[PDB]
């Protein structure tokens, strides 16, 4: 099997907001590979549920298996029950 | 940043030889992530230490990046060789 | 913060069958780092759910975080909510 | 086999210099996991090599096999060739 662990800011562009069953969930888009920058290659990014603790400006860590599922002729990559950590940033 | 790190068995369907700078040595393509299904699976390279037979479970594990056409290398990786018996039942 | 990915085998020395009032649960018990062949330091080993599905000769690869923890004069490591999947064997 | 990890910025805490053969170089020292809020219990720190590019204040993930080693009564816990890379912030 296949174990995904990206670290990345959670940002105004990385990150949405969602109203669920219960209350509202941050979502977070981080990549799946890396790439040279300012290369003309296409990165994957997936998907993953933040904790409500979790502000705009924070470094954290999301780790998990990540599936590729179809909505449409869209591909959605999404991390499955993945473990979202804070990183302490002074 | 972006760490991957997959297990899977150095069979004959996922592994070839290549003449390197130094002798003959093995490639293993393995899975970046899983499908539910009609989606297109992106694969990663590595080079295998030696001592890896055909049939050996590894563990391959560091970052993937992207390089352009494209190829998913892994770059420097870990590579462990997993420990596996049959079962006493 | 801190991942940790251990792939191993459920066998008879690492693996455990514990009756609760959901029914039975299995535990595996993995090494957290390695040693060198004749030393000294005993190894953490980190407590892990299984799912029902997995039987012994099974491969699987916990991963996720581990907290340390008190109890008595046994401190007991275990991981948090982790991932847990098999690997495929031919 | 077993992977670890570890995500942290580097600091004068963390953060040593040493001579090497190869010259003076930085090594990071990272928790290897976490403790309970009210437990007396010892965390493990590991050890790696940090490239000469990073410096105090950056944050860099390291990854890969850790070994644990005894000298006299002294338990070292070392990154075996990790991978460490920066993370932007």
């Known amino acids: 099997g296949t ?5 990345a800011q959670a940002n105004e562009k ?4 969602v109203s669920t069953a219960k ?3 941050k979502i977070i888009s981080v990549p799946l590979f890396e790439k040279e920058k300012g290369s003309n ?4 990014y ?3 549920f933040l904790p409500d603790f979790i ?5 954290v860590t999301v780790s998990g298996r990540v599936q590729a599922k179809e909505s449409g002729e869209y591909v959605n990559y999404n991390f ?8 302490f940033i002074t």
Chains 1, 3 share one sequence.
Do not use: C
Request: net charge positive; hydrophobic share 40%; aromatic share 4%.
């Open 41 to 44: 290659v296409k990165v994957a």
């Open 3 to 7: 174990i995904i662990t990206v670290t």
């Open 23 to 25: 209350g509202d969930k």
């Open 14 to 17: 990385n990150t949405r907001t």
């Open 46 to 48: 997936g998907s993953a």
């Open 55 to 59: 502000q705009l400006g924070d470094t």
């Open 80 to 87: 499955v029950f993945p473990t979202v950590e804070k990183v």
